[PDB]
């Protein structure tokens, strides 16, 4: 029944938004700790593994991982 | 400490991936029920509200909502 399915979607989006906001805050912290310690960014090791993880969803999955990594970027 | 922050990221991504997979399955169902009942797609009402919800994250947020809606599209 559509309305039950719709309310399942709204529950899923509440959970996703909360987790993405937290992921953005944690990534920002990791960024601070990288810059405040030098050392290269882990693009080809760790970031590529994150993109591969979400690639299980298909190519819109790869793009989703790319946006999550953008959300973790430092602001002045 | 980086390694603790890194393990928090990996926990957050496990949760996000599980919820996105479920959201894809539920959206597909809503799609089936729409087609199998006619009626217009709720682009300007419901989909726009989902994009607005994720827009709280910034423009990468708008793009994230667009990809979540794509993941819900029917396959033969």
UniProtKB/Swiss-Prot annotation, chains A, B:
One of its GO terms (biological process) is chorismate metabolic process. Pathway: Metabolic intermediate biosynthesis; prephenate biosynthesis; prephenate from chorismate: step 1/1. The record marks 74-76 as: Important for activation via AroG. GO terms for cellular component: cytoplasm; plasma membrane. The formation of the complex with AroG activates the chorismate mutase activity by more than two orders of magnitude to a catalytic efficiency (kcat/Km) typical for chorismate mutase. This activation is primarily caused by a more than 30-fold-decreased Km value, but also by a four-fold increase in kcat. The activity of the complex is inhibited by phenylalanine and tyrosine by about 70 and 40%, respectively. Its main location: cytoplasm. Residues 1-76 form the Chorismate mutase domain. The record marks 34 as: Important for catalysis. Chorismate binds at residues 34, 43, 47. It catalyses: chorismate = prephenate. It is an enzyme of class 5 (isomerase). Homodimer. Interacts with AroG. This is Intracellular chorismate mutase. The chain holds residues 28 to 103 of 105 of the full protein.
């Amino acid at each position: 029944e559509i309305d039950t399915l719709r309310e399942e979607i709204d529950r899923l989006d509440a959970e996703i938004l909360a987790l993405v906001k937290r992921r953005a805050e944690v990534s920002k912290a990791i960024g601070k700790a990288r810059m405040a310690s030098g050392g290269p960014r882990l693009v080809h090791s760790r970031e590529m593994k994150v993109i591969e993880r979400y690639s299980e969803l298909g190519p819109d999955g790869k793009d989703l991982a790319i946006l999550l990594l953008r959300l973790g970027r430092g602001r002045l």
